Design a protein around this ligand. Structure first.
Ligand code: NI
Lengths: 71, 61
């Protein structure tokens, strides 16, 4: 049935995961660079960490979904 | 079949409750009041997933 994952669906999710892995890498590096520059811009820590967290959380969900889909 | 979709669904629920309990733990003492209800739900889902997987595996053998 349409509900169940297909090779086509898996290929698409793989594609989404790869674009997001790049974006996640960007936030990782930006957070790293923030920490390395401390104390400058310490007021930006929580915001930057939240943004970074959200992208990695989404990435982790999709990766776990992909594994389950592939099956 | 199609136990497989049913196992897939529990697999996902199990993964989410794992995340939820992990986060709740790391966040302590915040929401310590929610520990037992979350553990009970997580246990129920993993138990049911365990059994259903065993069933699918007798099936498919
Ligand atoms: Ni942890």
């Amino acid at each position: 049935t349409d509900n169940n994952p297909t090779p086509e669906a898996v290929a698409d999710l793989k594609k989404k995961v790869r674009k997001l892995n790049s974006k996640a890498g960007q936030m990782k590096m930006d957070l790293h660079d923030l920490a390395e520059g401390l104390p400058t811009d310490y007021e930006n820590l929580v915001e930057t960490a939240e943004k970074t967290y959200e992208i990695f959380r989404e990435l982790d969900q999709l990766k776990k979904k992909l594994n389950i889909w592939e099956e």
